[PDB]
Design a protein around this ligand. Structure first.
Ligand SMILES: [Cl-]
Ligand SMILES: [Cl-]
Ligand SMILES: [Cl-]
Ligand SMILES: [Cl-]
Ligand SMILES: [Cl-]
Ligand SMILES: [Cl-]
Ligand SMILES: [Cl-]
Ligand SMILES: [Cl-]
Ligand SMILES: [Cl-]
Ligand SMILES: [Cl-]
Ligand SMILES: [Cl-]
Ligand SMILES: [Cl-]
Ligand SMILES: [Cl-]
Ligand SMILES: [Cl-]
Ligand SMILES: [Cl-]
Ligand SMILES: [Cl-]
Ligand SMILES: [Cl-]
Ligand SMILES: [Cl-]
Lengths: 118, 184, 184, 118
């Protein structure tokens, strides 16, 4: 169940502290059974868990985010999430994630992530 | 001076009929008896513990909705008026938090909020198009987050939903949701 | 793009079934149509104006209680769970206020609060023994004060009730009530 | 109806700005019909409207009050309320009211009244 998972998807390319990509197969757990359509929060968890993974800081907490679910994702798609750090301050990393199915943008998020060295 | 047993028990049944989510502790303070007394009173009355009562209230709610089912729904659906407003609670357990700090991961609260909005809308097809969210306070291991969803606009193609999430009385999460829908 | 008439009307009926106290203005903002449209929709649906809907909801409530009757009750009793919690609203009119300032007299809000506590408790005999009250903000001509009463303790002889009163979302009045009761 | 009345009872003695007494007959409007017992708020309105009456200030607003309903008042009683000013500051008058039926105390209130010269 999505809320009980740490990192969602498989990491396939990572450049620590800079950018990363993960892939996620869309199985029947991730969709509504009558339509076959992925649940927004599965794609969100992939994007947000990717940001947390790539940021090399002891603690990383999501402060804010804006997301668009641009296309319907379907049972049996593979969603490639591509994350990159746009800016970094003393307190935040600003991270953009664009997720694809083959070559069509299906999801875009902006993440404002808090961090600290504890 | 304190209530006779039979009067106290009638009064417990009434409290619970009116607020199923009232705790043993709160009942205890209400009647100025021990938690033990409240527990023994529940046993006599066949009133299940709080967590069982929540799952029972929620079962009734899953029948009122259509966009999502119990198996997929994140948290327990405690209150629903389809197309108008809804609430859920989510107990935050060890799998939802970082090991060192005990803080809930970002996607946990979003997952509660998004499924609440999906559940809220009773149309053949429903899905989130856009969302905007803020994490207002750290949520912690063993907290219960109560999410409140309400419809604020409805167009031909979208429901705009506003979500506020609480731990006790503190606001911890806030989100706007643009819900796409279609009757086909 | 906006809802077809028949869809809008279904959606109005649902909004009102779920919150009888929703205003034409609020319905208007919800569906992004004019107040005129909402009014004409109510007429088509035979939904009475807000104030009529309040008196109707309240009639049902007077049957649930026993300590007080409609004729004596100050305000309209909008929500009641006997021995647990209740709410009323009171429209503040010219007779309740000073001429120069338009401020509600002290005893008006106390009168709403006291009858709410009396109404709340469902015992043969009920009366206030003690009360402690604060007037937190000036209440004004043509405001609606919403009073919220809840039971916080029950002994063999008393219900302790806590009252909070609001104008929109501002707290304006606060009171503790020690209610005597007896079953004879 | 009590909330639609300005001054409750008849004034029978007044010493402006200092102390006053009023009497109130308890008719069937002021009681619950099944018990015959006066409503707390009728006695409160008598006490509080008496304070407001006796204070000689352009505006007088009740800020706080503590009251005790010491005896049951009954249909056909006359309640004599006796009010007096205990203290006065630049912003408040502190007023005590004790109300009687014949010679038995049936009600006691303390009132903290705000005032201003507008
Ligand atoms: Cl780096
Ligand atoms: Cl979704
Ligand atoms: Cl930067
Ligand atoms: Cl793109
Ligand atoms: Cl008893
Ligand atoms: Cl409990
Ligand atoms: Cl005990
Ligand atoms: Cl439990
Ligand atoms: Cl908690
Ligand atoms: Cl439509
Ligand atoms: Cl209205
Ligand atoms: Cl219009
Ligand atoms: Cl109206
Ligand atoms: Cl108002
Ligand atoms: Cl003087
Ligand atoms: Cl009373
Ligand atoms: Cl003085
Ligand atoms: Cl005395």
């Amino acid at each position: 169940s999505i809320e009980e998972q740490e990192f969602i998807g498989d990491l396939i390319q990572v450049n620590p502290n800079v950018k990363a990509q993960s892939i996620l197969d869309i199985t029947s757990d991730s969709v509504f059974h009558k339509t076959g359509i992925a649940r927004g929060h599965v794609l969100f968890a992939q994007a947000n868990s990717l940001c947390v993974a790539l940021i090399k800081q002891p603690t990383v907490l999501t402060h804010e985010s804006s997301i668009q679910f641009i296309e319907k994702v379907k049972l049996n798609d593979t969603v490639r999430a591509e994350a990159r750090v746009v800016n970094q301050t003393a307190k935040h990393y600003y991270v953009e994630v664009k997720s694809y199915v083959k070559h069509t943008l299906v999801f875009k998020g902006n993440f404002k992530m808090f961090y600290d060295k504890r």
